[PDB]
Design a binder for these strands. Structure first.
Lengths: 86, 151, 142, 364
RNA sequence: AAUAGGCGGCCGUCGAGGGCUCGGGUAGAAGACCCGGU
RNA sequence: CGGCCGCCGAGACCCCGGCGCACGGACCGAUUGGUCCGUGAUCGGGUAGGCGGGCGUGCCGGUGGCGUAGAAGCCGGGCC
RNA sequence: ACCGAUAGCGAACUAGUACCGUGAGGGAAAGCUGAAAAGCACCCCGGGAGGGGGGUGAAAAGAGCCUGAAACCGGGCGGCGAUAGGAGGGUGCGGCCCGAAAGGAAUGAGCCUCCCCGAAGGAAACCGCGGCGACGCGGGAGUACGAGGGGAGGGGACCGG
């Protein structure tokens, strides 16, 4: 089970997509290492204890970031928060 | 006006009174009721006596334009609505009597609900310059109160 | 928390990474703010900072740009310039920053980090002026 | 520009607000080598005039001239505290302070009113009128132990400065009972010597004669007289509007141009006038008296108090200073004096001048 | 002064310290401020 | 300044499901209507303006009904 | 097949009335208790107006009287609330709160676990080679994954709003 940080939404300069989030896992710093996490689940724990579940589907950039698709989008208070992979 | 805005009135433990079409300021009535809310009946009566005697200002929180402050902490705008105090004191005496008649100890009566409303307006006119007649009206006030014997 | 020794680091290249970290959610403390360097000409750098200090609101001085003149405040404002200062997220990020000059008595014996991407060894020539000299010219305490 | 004139009033004294405290504060201190307390406090008594042989440089040197003087009464100060300052990140910080324990008061002017004996005052009873929460069960042993700790810190070297906390004694002159507490810096270049000076003077009385030198310059700090709300004509000295003006004459004409679309902070306006914190520099100390008397030629001594007493003030009974000129404040105001922080290159000699006449006629 | 400060003392986990009320102005448009109160 | 190598980025382009429209075809309903199938890369923004269908209100001729075991009206809420 | 009290004649009523202008002349507003007044007897308080008990009535519908909306004002309740900037809204979700009915649901909700197919699209580990370099090429492989479409088990009250 891996640990990660929420970076931002998938976005253009002025356009935002609320169903996809950029995640930076702790000790993954390349496409080669990030590609091993595709298909795994990502869990975000709400302050009240509710769990929001997404899945890793693609790698983002080349510095080890990944893209996560959430059926229920994160609330935006999760920006800079810490998520748990599997 | 006859009805009260209290929901769960209990005739066994509570007493109520009201006054209608009072010719006082509804704004100052609201301000005085805000302060009287939640106090014991004796404390409220002494409060009104002090206000009438000018020994104790009533703070203003909603209608306080161009009002000077008063000595001491918490002031802030304040004034002395003598007429409102007198009318509300009469209403409080009436509710005290109602409770006593029902058989409730007057020393344990707490003002659980007190409210003021704007009633009918009596229209009038005053003459002004350039042949213009202008409104000159009186705004009446309704007062409702219900007290409970606490334990 | 992470402590950075700003001795011999480019001001802008240090501030960029520090602001990125503050956004990512790390506590950052810059310990040697006065020893950061700014590349260019001494006279033009001093003139630019003097003009920044001279900026003010004509109608009321109590509202005009309070641009800094101390070393620590200069570094703090340089970092603040690279954050969404008008957003709650940016304000929270900026609140996670502390900047000091010299190593205070509470930070001795700790591991002082360094920014490799902002070291002065990159520069072809050492034609730079220190934030301490800039503050001294402006008339700050230190 | 067509016609040009200097601005009305000074922007260097803004905001023109009421003083923060009626007790004046001193932000800066003179740099001196002599180990002495830098300043003194007193109460304004009044004004008179003298005739003396001038000694400072000028055309009127060696000639008899008229000079007004302000007499301010200065009962001795009680040195009751010592405070130590270390260096902080942004400035000086208070490391610690220590005050002497309660002692009997031997200068309270008690009168045997019928019934009950004399009250038998003591310190910490006049002081509670100002502090209101003083140490309980405070003893000489713990006081000495605290003083020793302070000295130990001084030896270690974390103390960069030391100051003396003193209190006035209005009850001596029967002006009032509530004292006033201040702290004064000490001259010298060694914190240990300054601390030893303060320690030697702890709990004792200090007089003007032991600190100030006759004939030297001083700076006077006080709170000016209150005038209340005043219009711009009196507050900033603007010009009256033309006599044909039908919307008033004692007001500013235009309060700004179209752009900027706001009223600038530099436009004269009405507001508080007087009761401001002010400092006047280079006031000469003419003479220091004792017990309400002034010694002129070692053979005749005259009572400074004019016939009928000072207007709005009582009779001078304690030590007093005769300052040359005017000082800010009202009668009975607390006024502080410090050695001149900015004296001229050429200054009068440090000694009492030759006084030929002192005005003691009725001033009311 | 959002890094929203330092220090000595007093109290709390009945109670220090205050406000109104009283006699007056070193003050004052209301507030505020200062001295006195056996 | 002369070139190169990765990545990010639209309602554009590709794919899946759904709606309507245009044209042609087969069925049922006693007036303008209904169901289904086929083709559309060569259909789907829109001001002035042109055309088609539908929603809602008062009264009349018919038809089928509801209501003091509670009509119209009014405040809040569920579903299409 | 006219309107239904701002409509219909200006006037559903003490209406060509009240009222405006010296005059010729101009000209409103305003319908409804209940089947029956049975229109509140008596008691406490208040100077009185009224208030509170207690009665009448299927229902106060209480004469300020059928129904009683909106704007506005007072109180109670749920959420926010004194370092924060945009025409007061849009997309997505997270706190706190309400959730009987009309929506789904013990003939089983949120949720957890397991198996199969899968469009457009689509990695990496590992190994060999090319380029000064960022990197790329061939095998891995059209594999892992993928919108959506199906099946099985566990738990037992929430999902929609």
């Amino acid at each position: 089970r891996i640990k990660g940080v929420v970076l931002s939404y998938r976005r253009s300069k002025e356009n935002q997509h609320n169903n996809v989030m950029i995640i930076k896992p702790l000790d993954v710093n390349s496409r080669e290492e990030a590609s091993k996490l595709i298909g795994r689940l990502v869990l975000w724990k709400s302050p009240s204890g509710k769990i929001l579940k997404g899945k890793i589907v693609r790698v983002h950039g080349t510095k080890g970031a990944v893209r996560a698709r959430f059926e229920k989008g994160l609330p935006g208070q999760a920006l800079g928060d810490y998520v748990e992979i599997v | 006006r006859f009805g009260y805005s209290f929901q769960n009135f209990d005739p066994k433990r509570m007493a109520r009174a009201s006054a209608r079409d009072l010719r006082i300021s509804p704004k100052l009535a609201v301000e005085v009721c805000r302060e009287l809310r939640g106090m014991m009946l004796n404390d409220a009566l002494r409060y009104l006596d002090d206000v009438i005697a000018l020994k104790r200002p009533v703070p203003l929180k909603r209608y306080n334009d161009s009002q000077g402050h008063k000595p001491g902490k918490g002031f802030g705008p304040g004034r002395y609505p003598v007429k409102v105090a007198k009318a509300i004191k009469k209403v409080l005496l009436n509710v005290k009597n109602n409770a006593v008649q029902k058989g409730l100890d007057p020393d344990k009566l707490k003002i659980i609900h007190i409210a003021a409303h704007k009633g009918p307006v009596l229209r009038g006119w005053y003459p002004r310059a350039f042949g213009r007649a202008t409104p000159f009206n009186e705004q009446t006030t309704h007062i409702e109160v219900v007290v409970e014997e606490i334990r | 928390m992470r402590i950075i020794n700003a001795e011999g680091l480019i001001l802008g290249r240090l501030a960029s990474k520090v602001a990125k970290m503050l956004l990512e959610g790390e506590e950052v403390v810059i310990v040697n703010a006065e020893k950061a360097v700014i590349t260019g000409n001494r006279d033009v750098i001093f003139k630019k900072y003097k003009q920044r200090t001279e900026l003010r609101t004509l109608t009321n001085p109590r509202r005009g740009p309070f641009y800094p003149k101390r070393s620590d405040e200069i570094v703090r404002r340089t970092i603040r310039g690279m954050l969404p200062w008008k957003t709650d997220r940016g304000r929270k990020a900026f609140k996670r920053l502390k900047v000091y000059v010299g190593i205070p008595k509470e930070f001795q014996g700790k591991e002082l980090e360094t920014i490799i991407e902002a070291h002065v060894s990159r520069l072809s020539r050492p034609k730079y002026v220190t934030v301490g000299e800039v503050a001294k010219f402006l008339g700050g305490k230190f | 520009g067509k016609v040009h004139r200097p601005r009305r009033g000074s922007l260097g004294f803004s905001p023109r607000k009421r003083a923060k405290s009626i007790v004046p504060r001193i932000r800066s201190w003179p740099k001196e080598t002599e180990v002495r307390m830098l300043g003194f406090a007193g109460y304004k008594a009044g004004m008179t005039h003298i005739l003396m042989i001038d000694d400072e440089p000028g055309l009127t040197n060696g000639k008899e001239i008229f000079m007004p003087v302000t007499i301010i009464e200065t009962p001795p100060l009680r040195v009751f505290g010592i405070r130590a300052y270390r260096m902080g990140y942004l400035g000086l910080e208070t490391a610690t302070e220590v005050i002497v324990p309660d002692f009997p008061l031997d200068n309270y002017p008690a009168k045997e009113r019928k019934g009950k004996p004399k009250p038998k005052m003591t310190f910490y009873k006049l002081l509670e009128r100002r502090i209101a929460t003083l140490p309980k069960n405070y003893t000489q042993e713990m006081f000495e132990q605290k003083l020793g700790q302070l000295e130990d810190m001084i030896k270690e070297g974390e103390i960069v400065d030391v100051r003396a906390i003193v209190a006035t004694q209005p009850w001596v002159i029967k002006l009032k009972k509530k004292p006033e507490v201040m702290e004064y810096a000490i001259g010298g270049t060694s914190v240990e010597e300054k601390f030893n000076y303060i320690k030697e003077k702890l709990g004792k009385e200090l007089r003007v004669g032991e600190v100030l030198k006759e004939g030297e310059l001083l700076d006077v700090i006080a709170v000016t007289k209150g005038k209340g709300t005043q219009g711009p004509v009196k507050r900033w000295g603007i010009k009256l509007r033309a006599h044909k003006d039908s919307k008033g004459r004692r007001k500013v004409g235009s309060i700004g141009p179209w752009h900027p679309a706001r009223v600038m902070w530099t436009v004269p306006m009405a507001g508080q006038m007087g009761f401001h914190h002010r400092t006047e520099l280079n006031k000469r100390l003419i003479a220091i008296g004792e017990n309400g008397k002034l010694k002129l030629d070692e053979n005749t001594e005259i009572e400074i108090t004019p016939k009928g007493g000072f207007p709005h003030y009582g009779i001078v009974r304690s030590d007093f200073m005769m300052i040359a000129g005017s000082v800010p404040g009202a009668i009975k105001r607390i006024i502080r004096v410090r050695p001149a922080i900015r004296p001229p290159k050429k200054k009068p000699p440090v000694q009492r001048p030759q006084i030929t006449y002192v005005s003691v006629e009725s001033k009311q």
